[PDB]
């Protein structure tokens, strides 16, 4: 493990930590600026929307105009966006800073993936994708915890800290990583449309919907939980950080132990259905929580439900495609970004209609996922019994 790989993973960890910094601070911005649920729904989803919009063009620029320069520009833009979020004191400024941060994320992530594909050997096209998901999920979980733990001192400390970390990452990128200066005299004219012309789309429908449902639930849960507990149980941001961080840690430590053991007894599809059923059962109980520690431990028992789903969908993508690790990774990343968009926007819009409406929406989405798995059960049975 050389310093190049460590820096490349740090560049992803910081960027996906930048998404979750906003959430624990909402016990303030809802009352300081007089904003409603839809305002937060747009404010948090802006980062994901900008990243999803700019990822294609960012990757194109990284391919055509070098990879180190694009990464360095993205780190500079990320630092500037974090600082402008910190200094500003209006909805418009924070909106623009979220947009710029999403742009920086969507222009750095393809660069880092390409540089890792360059450095890593040819036979490790699957393990690198596993590291991608591991780092992304770790950042997505540890975002809110650090954000809240820094928000205790002041409203602007977490974003100054994020900007400082971005500057440090940019310095490390300048001083450490390197890419070749020369280029091929004559390439190939294929332009790679062949994969898109040799794809069975029906076999890819189920993993796409499964990962979209997982991403929507996981992203909307944090946004809903922050506001719901700040209203009903009026948590300080410290309590929100404790809940999110503890739930994420428990989910990670149970996933790194029990997943393979569960797989030796259960198929991926049935296990996914059972995990969705467990999650919806826990979310039903979430409505009736009326005290401190019950709704505190609800998050602890929720995060494991999705940490038992994400690796299952990753392995499903790895297995059902074949040798096309790159295409599976691309689809998984794109739909994870789409879920991280569609989650908070709805979880904020429905909050104004009623306090518990987004809980019903999450329950309905989990039910839709589990019934989709049950429908695919008939298809897999038909495939199984028609050949043996």
């Amino acid at each position: 493990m050389n310093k190049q790989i460590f820096v490349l993973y740090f560049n992803i960890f910081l960027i996906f930590l930048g998404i979750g910094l906003v959430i624990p601070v909402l016990p303030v911005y809802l009352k300081d600026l007089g904003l409603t649920g839809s305002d937060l729904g747009l404010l948090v989803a802006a980062f994901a929307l900008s990243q999803m919009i700019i990822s294609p063009f960012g990757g194109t620029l990284a391919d055509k105009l070098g990879k180190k320069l694009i990464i360095c520009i993205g780190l500079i833009l990320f630092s500037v966006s974090e600082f402008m979020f910190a200094v500003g004191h209006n909805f418009s400024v924070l909106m623009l800073s979220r947009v710029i941060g999403g742009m920086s994320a969507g222009m750095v992530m393809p660069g880092v993936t390409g540089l890792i594909a360059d450095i890593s050997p040819s036979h490790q096209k699957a393990k690198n994708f596993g590291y991608m998901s591991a780092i992304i999920n770790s950042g997505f979980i540890l975002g809110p915890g650090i954000g809240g733990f820094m928000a205790e001192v002041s409203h602007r400390m977490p974003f100054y800290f994020a900007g400082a970390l971005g500057i440090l990452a940019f310095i490390m990128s300048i001083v450490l990583i390197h890419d070749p200066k020369k280029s091929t005299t004559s390439g190939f004219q294929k332009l790679e449309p062949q994969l898109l012309t040799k794809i069975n789309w029906k076999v890819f429908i189920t993993p796409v919907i499964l990962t979209l449902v997982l991403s929507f639930g996981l992203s909307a849960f944090q946004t809903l939980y922050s506001l719901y507990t700040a209203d009903k149980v009026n948590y300080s941001p410290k309590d929100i950080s404790i809940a999110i961080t503890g739930g994420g840690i428990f989910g990670a430590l149970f996933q790194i132990y029990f997943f393979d053991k569960f797989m030796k007894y259960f198929s991926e599809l049935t296990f996914i259905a059972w995990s969705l059923l467990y999650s919806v059962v826990v979310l039903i109980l979430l409505v009736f929580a009326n005290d401190y520690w019950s709704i505190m431990l609800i998050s602890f028992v929720v995060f494991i439900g999705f940490n038992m789903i994400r690796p299952a969908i990753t392995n499903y993508f790895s297995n059902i495609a074949g040798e096309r690790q790159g295409f599976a990774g691309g689809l998984n990343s794109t739909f994870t970004s789409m879920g991280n968009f569609i989650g908070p926007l709805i979880a904020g819009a429905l909050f104004d209609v009623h306090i518990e409406a987004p809980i019903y929406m999450a329950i309905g989405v989990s039910l839709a996922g589990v019934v989709i798995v049950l429908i695919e059960k008939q298809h897999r049975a038909k495939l199984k019994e028609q050949n043996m």
Partner: antibody
Amino acid sequence: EVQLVESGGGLVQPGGSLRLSCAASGFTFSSSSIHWVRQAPGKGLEWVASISSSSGSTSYADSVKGRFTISADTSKNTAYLQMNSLRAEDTAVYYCARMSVENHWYYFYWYMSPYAMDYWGQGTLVTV
Amino acid sequence: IQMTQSPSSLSASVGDRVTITCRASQSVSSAVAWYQQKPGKAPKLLIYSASSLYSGVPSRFSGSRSGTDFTLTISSLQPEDFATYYCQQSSSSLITFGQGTKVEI
């Protein structure tokens, strides 16, 4: 146009050692992989060794696995292959070739260029 | 990965269609290339990916893929085309070459 110059080969006592060199000229070495193949007198081809400069990975054929060794010096863009043991079967004409190894970004995913030996340097000959 | 090319030898006249088959005991996706080797000269690439077309090769040399079968087709056999062809597998780290097909005129 580019071309790789190959040097080495000659009369060799069985069980001996030898070093064959392939020097690049005019093309990128970091974004390419150097592959050594052989041709027996009056017979077919078979890929012998493979090295990638950027990734650093090396591989050898199952017919001759772990006996010979390969290396690539990026300072002057050269590839070296070392024989440590020889036999009567090893006599052949060896060729040095290059396959491009670089990713290209389709929107929302990278893809790898296909494996295809573009340029072949003039092969040397090794006997006994 | 075992690879078999047929026929071992083939005789054809000028302008006659020539078909060469290459089959693998294991799936190799579409990473099969086709090379041409002159007598006493370095092999020169003919077709890089399955059914593709390299730069400088005449269009009369074509490739096709059907499951395990990889087929090379030549519509017309100019006397300059007398050489030895090869099918190469490069799907994985290991690389294998076909037996060869020296064409008689």
